[PDB]
Design a binder for this molecule. Sequence first.
Ligand SMILES: [Cl-]
Ligand SMILES: [Cl-]
Ligand SMILES: [Cl-]
Ligand SMILES: [Cl-]
Ligand SMILES: [Cl-]
Lengths: 311, 311, 311, 311, 311
Amino acid sequence: VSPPPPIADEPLTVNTGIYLIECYSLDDKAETFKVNAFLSLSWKDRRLAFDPVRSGVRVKTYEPEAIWIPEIRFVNVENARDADVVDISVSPDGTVQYLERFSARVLSPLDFRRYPFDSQTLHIYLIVRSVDTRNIVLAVDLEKVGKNDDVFLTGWDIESFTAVVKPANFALEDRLESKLDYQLRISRQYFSYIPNIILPMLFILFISWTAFWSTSYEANVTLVVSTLIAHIAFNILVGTNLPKTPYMTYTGAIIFMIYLFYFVAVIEVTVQHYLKVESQPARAASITRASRIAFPVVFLLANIILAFLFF
Amino acid sequence: VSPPPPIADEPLTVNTGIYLIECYSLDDKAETFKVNAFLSLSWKDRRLAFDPVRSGVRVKTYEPEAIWIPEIRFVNVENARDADVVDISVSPDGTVQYLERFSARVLSPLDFRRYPFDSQTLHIYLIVRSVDTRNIVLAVDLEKVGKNDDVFLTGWDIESFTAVVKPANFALEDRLESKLDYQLRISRQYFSYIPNIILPMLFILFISWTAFWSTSYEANVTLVVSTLIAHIAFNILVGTNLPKTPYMTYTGAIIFMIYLFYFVAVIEVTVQHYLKVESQPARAASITRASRIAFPVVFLLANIILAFLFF
Amino acid sequence: VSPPPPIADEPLTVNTGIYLIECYSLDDKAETFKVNAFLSLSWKDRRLAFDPVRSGVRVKTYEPEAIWIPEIRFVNVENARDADVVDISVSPDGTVQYLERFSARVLSPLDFRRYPFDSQTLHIYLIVRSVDTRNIVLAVDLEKVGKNDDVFLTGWDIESFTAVVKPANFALEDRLESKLDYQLRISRQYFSYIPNIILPMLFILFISWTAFWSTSYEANVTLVVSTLIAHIAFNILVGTNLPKTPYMTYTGAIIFMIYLFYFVAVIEVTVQHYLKVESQPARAASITRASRIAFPVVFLLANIILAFLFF
Amino acid sequence: VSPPPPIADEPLTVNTGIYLIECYSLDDKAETFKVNAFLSLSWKDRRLAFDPVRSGVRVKTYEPEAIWIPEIRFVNVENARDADVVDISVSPDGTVQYLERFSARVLSPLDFRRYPFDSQTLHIYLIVRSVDTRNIVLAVDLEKVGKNDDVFLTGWDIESFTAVVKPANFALEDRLESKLDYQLRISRQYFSYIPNIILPMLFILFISWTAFWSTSYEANVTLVVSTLIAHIAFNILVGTNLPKTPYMTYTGAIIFMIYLFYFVAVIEVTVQHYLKVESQPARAASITRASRIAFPVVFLLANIILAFLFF
Amino acid sequence: VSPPPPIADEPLTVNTGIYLIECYSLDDKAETFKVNAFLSLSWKDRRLAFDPVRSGVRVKTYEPEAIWIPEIRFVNVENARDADVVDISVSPDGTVQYLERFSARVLSPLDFRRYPFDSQTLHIYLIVRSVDTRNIVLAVDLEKVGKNDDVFLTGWDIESFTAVVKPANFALEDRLESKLDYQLRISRQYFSYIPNIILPMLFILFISWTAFWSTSYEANVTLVVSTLIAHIAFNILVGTNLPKTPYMTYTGAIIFMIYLFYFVAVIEVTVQHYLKVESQPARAASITRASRIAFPVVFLLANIILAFLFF
Ligand SMILES: [Cl-]
Ligand SMILES: [Cl-]
Ligand SMILES: [Cl-]
Ligand SMILES: [Cl-]
Ligand SMILES: [Cl-]
């Protein structure tokens, strides 16, 4: 079986529709998500268009290997989707109404700049390769493009599941292709980050700043160096779930700043001590007293500047 | 082969039954569990209803590709279930008695608020999509809805395996669907948490409070900072098996409180020292003496308030 | 094809035999092991019992889809086994001699109480569901129940592979089932635990007890607190390969005891210091001197009591 | 169906073309990458060359199991590729135009010497084994050798996807083979390494050098030893994503140098202290003062020498 | 189709040959390696031996499901191999020349005693089960037993790929089996271990020995205890890629020795301090001075003794 012939020279319009059933396993590091949905396909095939006079049926149900079915694929997938045909039903005009339930691992990249406050647009690209006798173009039937209310993506708020109605028609290996953009907008649930990651990581850094109210080099060494060890240990605990990005992250910049703040604090502790031992207690005291206001104020402004630059 | 026709306009009732054989691999982070069970299906098909007069058989056993079998699927699954048909037997009225043994990775969310004292309700959603000629509705045969006595879910106490008898009939992509709720109630085995996690994590925090019986800033710095490092290391050891939740956890709140308690203790140690060095030993001593009662009492009340709020 | 009819009312006896080829991947945390073995089945089917007079064959070899074969399954499996039929051969009396090579992930629970000195009994449950016309019962042919000499389970000593000859006949979903218990006895290789885990973990705890020969609170704080950090780090290094058990482990109890011993040592160090500073050096010295004998003696007896209770 | 016969003695030329659709999962440790692409094959088969006079078709579309198709395989693959035939179309001269969409895990080694500034050349080896009647040779159709604009390999910059036009014809197990080299040039995105790995790891090492401005052995011991612990912890945090190489890495050498620099600093701290205690403060002071310039200058030159040797 | 009959009573000799294409993923912990190779099989079947007079062919090429092919399996595999038949060609005498390309996960145990200087012998066991009419025996065609020059096993040097020519004929479940031993000799690339693991781990231990040139108990406590923490952290960093062995490893013994050396050093530090405080400075000094020579000399000899015992 090959494709239905045109009346004139018109291409075959395959009306599409993706309905999300289950959506899960969003791997931040791999920039992949797993989706279990319904794929809806519709096209007219006059060859199987029959008369409600003679035909012993009103709606003719077929098996997938009895009629011509368009080779519809996904662009951004790891391997081909695990699809199970649900129903194929031909209306007397020849209109085929295909439906399958598929599960696929979609490969859509993410923007980690505004992390962990970020929002993403996940993409599902439907494609059809035009054939010898008839050229095939994709379309969006917005009545069969949706999502189940129960759909849950852990740590994210599902905003919308839509499709860019106009297909991307282009040439690929001497044949026309029709690509459709199914967009899934999601926004990260950042509550947990504040009391679980941000606040304990700020407390450890604040502990080091107590060395600006001490003259004991032994106590100061223990303070700044031990908190630096606590910091690294905390970051080990709090995992690492992001890939290596070519760009700079909001969180990326803050972390670097914190490592710089540990280094500067050591320099201060060292400077204060050297002046004190080299009989210059006024300079040693003035530097320590200044640092008490300097370190928090600089930290505050630097975070404000960064926040502004990223948001 | 398509569905049996009605006598009037009545829908086809498919009686269902899930019998748990093996239940395992409950992934807290992924909110998934693996299940190996029996799926029982029963429906009347008059087309294959024959006479115990003529028929050379008493009970007619068939192969799955000889008779019409309803397309029964699971809603909350990763990929389609790995099922192996056990037996199909037609009674001479046409009553089909289908049975298969399946294994599926079910995707049912969890509530981590009362963790590690929590209890869950796992869901297994059976679905049937109604077809062109005949509409299909699901039913519960409570005589074939159960669980094997040996069924073990490591770290959980299996309470019950039941089914919500009334199906959820609704419209989806221009056709009727019939959904059934199979509920698996489980309650976490929290013994281990008390001597393995809770008690050692409380001991490390209690060690820091010994700085309220010392005047040695060097000893106090080592006490509060080193125990903070021990705390983080202990938490690294004791793993992290929960996802990022939009809500706040009982354990989540207590942990944050402990990080705050390390910070407050540092402030005290720093305050006591600054007053002592700035020739105010009475204030330095009164603050330390108060902290001896303050820190445990505040901790006790805060834990009581939290416990009350979560339970 | 359905089952052979009885001469009278006798059930069909299917003689079984499992022969272990490869045995591996014993996951302590998941309580699963992977097995690659031979499954041997034998039953009489008079329908295919032919005469050595006429028959142009002496031993008739068949294809699995030419003759009736009993639906034999495993109870405690994740998914159904990957089996490849090796040989089916019918003797003139009708005796079928079936043989397949299968690989399955078996789900058998473990008792971690006596860990790492423990011994386990792994279970492989063979099952057959009786059918409409003929009831089916399982049997053990002990001549085809064995294991390959080379079979290796890393870190365990394979003691025996046997079968409980009497099957467990019971009712399940209105039909009889015949269950067979194939037991695989294994005993843990505990050598490594003594010099790699037990001894280094005891050395770190012994280091803390040197604070009973010091009067330097700074040295004592560093001793007890730093060794506690070393302890946790060591346990992080030495992994965590056991699940969360409802019961208490021999190793579980010892670990808790060690955390208690770190806490008590801190109390001592704190007590000795407070008395010394509050001008009571005799009490401070008597407590320290006592602890020198107290801490090791109590530890020794407590370990003896626990060892006795678990073994 | 076997191969088309030659007109004379000429071998069958199979024109090839790989078009990258999705490229991902580059495992540095495993030296593997996953690829989803189009495989294009073209050859003349006069047996199916038909006349545009009689033939009721203009372009004859076939099924893969209707015509002879060359056995094309990949050399450096884990398992055989998951390919799905897209289109087979015969032109009247007999020219077959085959196209499939495949996904394979390619096994191409990497050079970690210049890491993390490295560049790689990934290889995809196409092979065809010549047969009894006709010998088969591979060719490159550069019009169907490309990559999708969207193709993204996280942490790498895709430079080019080309093919070495001249095939590698050789003998293997008494038959000719024709191998084609598809090269994928990639260059690592090293930005992240500077502020996330290099700079914090340099700060910790610089902290240790402050012991050259102190005379307190207690402070110096804490400085050099604690920073060494911070260093190791940081490296644990920053993962380990490279295999065990027979050669020496740029990063490999620098790391070893840093461990040597921690050791030398300890020796200095120990030397300075021993001279000071053995009443030689001039030697103790001269060594410390020298080290202030020595340690950074030596480090700078050593890094310059290494950088030169590797780049 | 069943096996070719004998002329007399002779068994069927199946000539074998494994040619390594890709060899990779050697999992030390799992004692498994993945192999992609060519399997060559040859046997005479007179039934298909045809006359170069009548036969319209010179070399008859067949499809696998047209002729009898021996059921050849691998003993030490996880699951059955993923094989794709490359070519089957019958010579006029009846000699069949079979060839397939397979990928399998081989399960061959390892000896970790001499690790990381160890050498292994990997095993690939070919087996054939004799059948009813004809008994089957295996043979080695050494002209088709080899390896591709490009074959790379990361971190290992491939020494040789050979086969034990004499097969292991034995009885298994009432039938004869013929087993062939394909041996793959490999030797570990130990360069990396010296500057990356051995040397940094020796430096940390040498740092602790500086406490033999100090009288400061506070400095000594920090030295020996902090280096012990650095040691454990280093070992965490440097991974753990070996299983739990019943025997003792060369590396295993050295590690235990290092933990003992940390313990003994603490004892010394404690002893020196107690004598010094109990007004015995001569004994305290003699012990410290001795330890300066004792600790390195004992370490040197112990390593020499161990090295001798393992190599
Ligand atoms: Cl697809
Ligand atoms: Cl399903
Ligand atoms: Cl099974
Ligand atoms: Cl391939
Ligand atoms: Cl195999």
